[PDB]
């Protein structure tokens, strides 16, 4: 499906970033951000 | 506005730039596909302090 | 319409997924979105 | 050299200053006993960029 | 004499414990040292 | 013995810092730093 992660440092930034939101602002806020991201990505033809 | 005119950076580097008042439009990205890396922000800030401590 | 407690922060996440799509393409963004959901599940998002 | 002449900061803020080329001797600390906080470094860097983007 | 792989970093840790002692006193430094050892034990230092 | 931590944000910086050393540089390096810190603190009359 997916190749080997072409850029794991990039991926780590994303995962760390959402980790920080969860710890500092909580799961409800991380849920809000992920919902807004999915809706944004759909505009660019990404599911 | 072609792709080179746009900033490419992870949410982590965008947050770092927000926290330190860095306009990523002014930072040259050296990561894959021109992405702005932590080291690009560090170099930019180091140089800004230099210019400011020499005004 | 749920409340956004920090739209300046939200804007940066949304600009980040836009720039992945623009510079790296839909496949890369699908991979990162898949990775992000999995990490969020480990936290409690779903 | 009395205590006010000396920098007081945690190893975390010292590392942050190293990474961004900040001379903590130039940053006014507002934490307990004058310790230099993350927010003090942020304010200093924001202002340095300002002076540099206005040279 | 063991090797220091990054003396600039070591210098900052040592200047940090000096500044706790100078500005906050021996008792505060004892507390922070006690806290630091305990966290390092959780990692593997001892 | 010790009062309530007079400044837990300060303490958190120290614990986070040594945490990062352990993850990025390993337990041997964190052991080295702690050894050098103890020797330094002793000069200031801290055990």
From Swiss-Prot, chains A, F:
It comes from the Bacteria. Coiled coil: none annotated. Signal peptide: none annotated. Homodimer. Part of the PDH complex, consisting of multiple copies of pyruvate dehydrogenase (E1), dihydrolipoamide acetyltransferase (E2) and lipoamide dehydrogenase (E3). In pull-down experiments interacts with CedA. Component of the pyruvate dehydrogenase (PDH) complex, that catalyzes the overall conversion of pyruvate to acetyl-CoA and CO(2). This is Pyruvate dehydrogenase E1 component. The lineage of its organism: Bacteria, Pseudomonadati, Pseudomonadota, Gammaproteobacteria, Enterobacterales. The gene is aceE. The chain holds residues 4 to 50 of 887 of the full protein.
Curated annotation (Swiss-Prot), chains B, D:
Transmembrane segments: none annotated. Residues 8-45 form the Peripheral subunit-binding (PSBD) domain. The pyruvate dehydrogenase complex catalyzes the overall conversion of pyruvate to acetyl-CoA and CO(2). It contains multiple copies of three enzymatic components: pyruvate dehydrogenase (E1), dihydrolipoamide acetyltransferase (E2) and lipoamide dehydrogenase (E3). Belongs to the 2-oxoacid dehydrogenase family. Forms a 24-polypeptide structural core with octahedral symmetry. This is Dihydrolipoyllysine-residue acetyltransferase component of pyruvate dehydrogenase complex. It comes from Escherichia coli (strain K12).
């Amino acid at each position: 499906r997916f190749p080997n992660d072409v850029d794991p440092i990039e991926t780590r930034d994303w995962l760390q970033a959402i980790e920080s939101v969860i710890r500092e602002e909580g799961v409800e806020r991380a849920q809000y951000l992920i919902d807004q991201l999915l809706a944004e990505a759909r505009k660019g033809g990404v599911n | 506005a072609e792709n080179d005119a746009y900033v490419h950076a992870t949410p982590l580097i965008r947050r770092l730039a927000r926290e330190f008042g860095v306009n990523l439009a002014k930072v040259k990205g050296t990561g894959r596909k021109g992405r702005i890396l932590r080291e690009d922000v560090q170099a930019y800030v180091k140089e800004a302090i230099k210019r400011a401590e020499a005004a």
